[PDB]
Design a protein around this nucleic acid. Structure first.
Ligand SMILES: [Zn+2]
Lengths: 25, 96, 87, 208, 150, 81, 100, 129
RNA sequence: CGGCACCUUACGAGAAAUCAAAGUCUUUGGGUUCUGGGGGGAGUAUGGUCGCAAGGCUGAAACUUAAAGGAAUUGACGGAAG
RNA sequence: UUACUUUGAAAAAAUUAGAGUGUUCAAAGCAGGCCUUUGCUCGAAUAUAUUAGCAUGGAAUAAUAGAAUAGGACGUUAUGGUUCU
């Protein structure tokens, strides 16, 4: 991959993890 | 003419405490001053020291071409008196 | 180099460059040995009687061989007032 | 040292100055700096012809020290020096290499004209760069006629002269031939005029 | 070189080898001292006194003529300023830049230069405190700087 | 150049060297005796002067400072001491 | 590896150079990197300079030239054969080609 | 900044000897530099050398004779016990028959052989061979 | 004198491309700060901390793998040029 | 004032290196050897320890202090004055 999109893909995936973990505050 | 300065020896490490020895009373400064006085009508324009292969060290002094008439025939007397008075070999020269 | 009894166990004491005093190696093929004939006062070349100099390949590669020959010949009298100590 | 008979004579100084041997190139390299007497305000550099003469005498003594005359190889790729080198070879017995120098003449021992000179004399290090390189491959000392911009790599004894002159090349080669023969003894002494004329050794165009 | 820059300039003065007064110099060791004192009372700093001395009176070096440095003579005659001259001019420059910044708040090269100048002030004051030219408790205050450099 | 007299450089190249790059550094400046046209009064002026020196007798500027050597005004003659 | 010691541009002792747009494709390219050609062309083709001088109402009227400076990016210039791929040793040669 | 005048001097000597020069200019001078040069001269690795007085730190011009393989400093000047001379000579010298390690002892600047003769030790200062 | 660079050479360095420094480094030591220890997992998880947010700084392990990679040579291929 | 370095003292025995010694050799052990003994008689070495502390010689190398408002040093028998034992 371009690696640029792979890091961005993880960034979109880190964002999802943070919001989901926030549900059970 | 030469000046009679006083020479304070370099104190030992275990020697007692005294006044601060000024740098004027050091060995090198007084020798330089008497060397400069030896050629009073002229003025020194440079000093060189030769470290020959044998180990002995030979001084050389560059004098101005001005007033060289006043010391040119007394080069030898200056050399011998200074060598007696200090212990170092000095060879005067005017670059001309 | 000599042994305990004094015999010279060294084979091939090598030559040294006349300009830089470096040792000329056995395969330094850029090194040369200039032989210059002696000339008598009649202007004749004396047969089999030469002044010989050796130059290392380093000096020849650097182009300093000409000035080194100028100095060596002037010090040996082969030349007069062509090489100057002060530049 | 050297007898005073080896000094620059006024006659030779007249030939050299009339032949413009003393005219050196505009730009002088640091290795050729000792040979410049003064720079002419236009830009030309004046050659110390006293030093040129002394280098000529040193070179002739080196040539005279070689036992076999055939062991000296004289080279010239410039057209201005080909006739000079050919007449030099005829008069002195040296081995001439006029025109193109085949790369490998000193190192490749199966080539046709494979020679093993003990000494190589070159008209110009720039146009004869290949010959100097192989001499630096097979331990051959090099004598060179050098101007003030000529490179000095792998040249041991440099004769300061004008390499790009029609009369300079012929005169200098004639002078070398005269001195080598003077030391060898064919010519009885240093004052007798030599039979060969400096007009001979000069390159001739196909016109004349 | 250039503690606070990338420059590598080497320009400076080159004192002559001779440490004696020139043969053509005619002023006395007193007349030089009174010239120095007159200009110091006129408000000149030691640098300007020495420049005027060589510029108009031929005094090549005050040391080769009088035997003492200019600041040493002023300190021996009680005319030495309280703040050393170079630290004073550095603090004055920092005050001028700080006033320009307060009127030009969007400038940032000058903010960078102010940080450089203040670090140089602090380094020099630290030296003068270690050599007891300034009191050990001497501290540079941005608020009270204008009083010192009034 | 492998062999060279470092202790006795040629005075031409010694004069071409930078003033700080000689064996012993030496200034290329000097002091001058300036004769203004109006009167005759010796005034010693530094060659590279940064001040507009005026002579005591007549309040006339003798030289104007420049980037390097000071420039003497017209009618002003200098003699190196 | 490093293809050019100059990195294909002309930026030394400098941080940033403002870009220019390619004539052909309008791509942002730094001004020093762009292939620049100065052209001074005749406004009228040599075929028509005769009949147009004859049709001119002015005696001794000089036809004006067309002055233009063209900027190309690397892809545009290579494609349009303004510059060509050179050999490893020929890249170093920086004198203008001897055509003019 | 300038951290070792002995190191600058020996580096200049090394570069001139490797490049075949028969002279090198050294600036600044010092007592330690002069006595280091004196030990090298006593052992023949250099010829006559010259001190130039400029009413400053000074300058030195050294004559090289082509005998120098390498001269260098050891930074820092480690403290050396008598039992450490064997390790230092093993690491720095090419053989057991030539070369010298220069030490600074309270008895003066000297090579490791003279130091062994008078049974003194100090700090290592450099080497020459 | 200071800069921005450049051209030639290679004493010398380097695996080479190349380099006036990337030289003065097994003939190893001028002063000093930071970083790396096969490839992935991974700049991920977790904790801390800064940010309005986006995110920034610090930052693993389990597990998996015999190579990944650097410079250059010959060929093959190119919807690249002559 | 130190730092540094030399030497000395110290660092238990065992262990290591190492001297002596035919356990039949050796690993080991600290034994043993003598013309044959109402007894004579070599031994069981020594190095090394190493930072800290102790004593000592040296004053290079690397620090530190000194006489600038003199608050400076000597007068040993310098001239007086105030005291204390
Ligand atoms: Zn484009």
């Amino acid at each position: 991959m371009r690696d640029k999109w792979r890091k961005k893909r993880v960034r979109r995936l880190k964002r999802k993890r943070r919001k989901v973990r926030a549900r059970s505050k | 003419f030469l000046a009679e300065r006083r020479i304070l020896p370099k104190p030992a490490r275990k020697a007692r405490k005294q006044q601060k020895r000024p740098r004027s009373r050091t060995l090198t400064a007084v020798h330089d001053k008497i060397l400069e006085d030896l050629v009073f009508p002229t003025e020194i324009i440079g000093k060189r020291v030769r470290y020959l292969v044998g180990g002995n060290k030979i001084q050389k002094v560059l004098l101005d071409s001005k007033d060289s008439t006043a010391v040119d025939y007394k080069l030898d007397s200056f050399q011998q008196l200074y060598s007696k008075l200090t212990g170092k070999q000095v060879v005067f020269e005017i670059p001309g | 180099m000599e042994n305990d009894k004094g015999q010279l166990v060294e084979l091939y004491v090598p030559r040294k460059c006349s300009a830089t005093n470096r040792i000329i190696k056995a395969k330094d093929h850029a090194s040369v040995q200039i032989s210059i004939a002696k000339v008598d006062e009649d202007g004749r070349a004396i047969a089999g009687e030469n002044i010989t100099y050796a130059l290392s390949g380093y000096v020849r590669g650097r182009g300093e061989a000409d000035d080194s020959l100028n100095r060596l010949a002037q010090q040996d009298g082969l030349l007069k007032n062509v090489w100057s100590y002060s530049r | 040292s050297l007898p005073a008979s080896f000094d620059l004579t006024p006659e030779d100084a007249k030939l050299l100055l009339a032949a413009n041997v003393h005219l050196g190139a505009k730009n002088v390299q640091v290795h050729n700096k000792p040979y410049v007497y003064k720079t002419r305000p236009d830009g030309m550099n004046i050659i110390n012809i006293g030093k040129t003469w002394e280098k000529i005498v040193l070179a002739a003594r080196i040539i005279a020290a070689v036992p076999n005359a055939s062991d000296v190889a004289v080279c010239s790729s410039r057209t201005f020096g080909q006739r000079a080198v050919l007449k030099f070879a005829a008069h002195t017995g040296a081995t001439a290499i006029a025109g193109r120098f085949t790369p490998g003449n000193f190192t490749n021992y199966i080539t046709r004209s494979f020679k093993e000179p003990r000494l190589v004399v070159v008209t110009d290090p720039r146009t004869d760069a290949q010959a100097i390189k192989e001499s630096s491959y097979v331990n051959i000392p090099v004598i060179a006629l050098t101007d003030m911009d000529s490179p000095s790599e792998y040249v041991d004894v440099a004769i300061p002269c004008n390499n790009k002159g029609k009369h300079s090349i012929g005169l200098i080669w004639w002078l070398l031939a005269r001195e080598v023969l003077r030391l060898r003894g064919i010519i009885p002494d240093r004052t007798t005029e030599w039979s060969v004329m400096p007009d001979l050794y000069f390159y001739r165009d196909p016109e004349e | 070189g250039r503690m606070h820059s990338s420059g590598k300039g080497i320009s400076s003065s080159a004192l002559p080898y001779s440490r004696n007064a020139p043969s053509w110099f005619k002023l006395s060791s007193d007349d030089v001292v009174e010239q120095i004192i007159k200009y110091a009372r006129k408000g000149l700093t030691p640098s300007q006194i020495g420049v005027i001395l060589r510029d108009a009176h031929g005094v090549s070096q005050a040391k080769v003529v009088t035997g003492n440095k200019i600041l040493r003579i002023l300190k021996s005659n009680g005319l030495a300023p309280e703040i050393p001259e170079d630290l004073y001019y550095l603090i004055k420059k920092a005050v001028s830049v700080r006033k320009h910044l307060e009127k030009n708040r969007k400038d940032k090269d000058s903010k960078f230069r102010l940080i450089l100048i203040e670090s140089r002030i602090h380094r020099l004051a630290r030296y003068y405190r270690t050599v007891a030219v300034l009191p050990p408790n001497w501290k540079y205050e941005s608020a009270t700087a204008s009083a010192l450099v009034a | 150049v492998l062999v060279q007299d470092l202790l006795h450089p040629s005075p031409a190249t010694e004069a071409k060297q930078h003033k700080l790059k000689t064996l012993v550094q030496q200034p290329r400046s000097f002091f001058m005796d300036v004769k203004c046209q109006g009167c005759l009064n010796i005034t010693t002026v530094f060659s590279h002067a940064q001040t507009a020196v005026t002579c005591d007798s007549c309040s006339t500027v003798l030289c104007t400072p420049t980037g390097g050597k000071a420039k003497l005004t017209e009618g002003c003659s200098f003699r190196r001491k | 590896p490093k293809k050019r010691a100059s990195n294909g541009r002309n930026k030394k002792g400098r941080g940033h150079v403002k870009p220019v747009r390619c004539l052909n494709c309008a791509r942002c390219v730094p001004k020093d990197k762009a292939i620049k050609r100065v052209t001074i062309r005749n406004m009228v083709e040599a075929a028509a300079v005769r009949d147009l001088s004859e049709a001119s109402v002015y005696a001794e009227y000089a036809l004006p030239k067309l002055y233009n400076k063209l900027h190309y990016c690397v892809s545009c210039a290579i494609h349009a054969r303004i510059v060509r791929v050179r050999s490893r040793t020929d890249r170093k040669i920086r004198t203008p080609p001897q055509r003019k | 900044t300038r951290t070792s005048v002995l190191a600058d001097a020996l580096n200049a000597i090394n570069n001139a000897e490797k490049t075949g020069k028969r002279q090198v200019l050294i600036r600044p001078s010092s007592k330690v530099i002069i006595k280091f040069l004196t030990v090298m001269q006593k052992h023949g690795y250099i010829g006559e050398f010259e001190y130039i007085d400029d009413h400053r730190s000074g300058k030195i011009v050294v004559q090289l004779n082509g005998r120098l393989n390498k001269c260098g400093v050891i930074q820092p000047r480690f403290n050396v016990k008598i039992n450490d001379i064997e390790r230092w000579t093993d690491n720095l010298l090419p053989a057991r028959q030539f070369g010298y390690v220069i030490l600074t002892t309270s008895a003066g600047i000297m090579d490791h052989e003279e130091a062994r003769r008078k049974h003194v030790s100090g700090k290592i200062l450099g080497f020459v061979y």
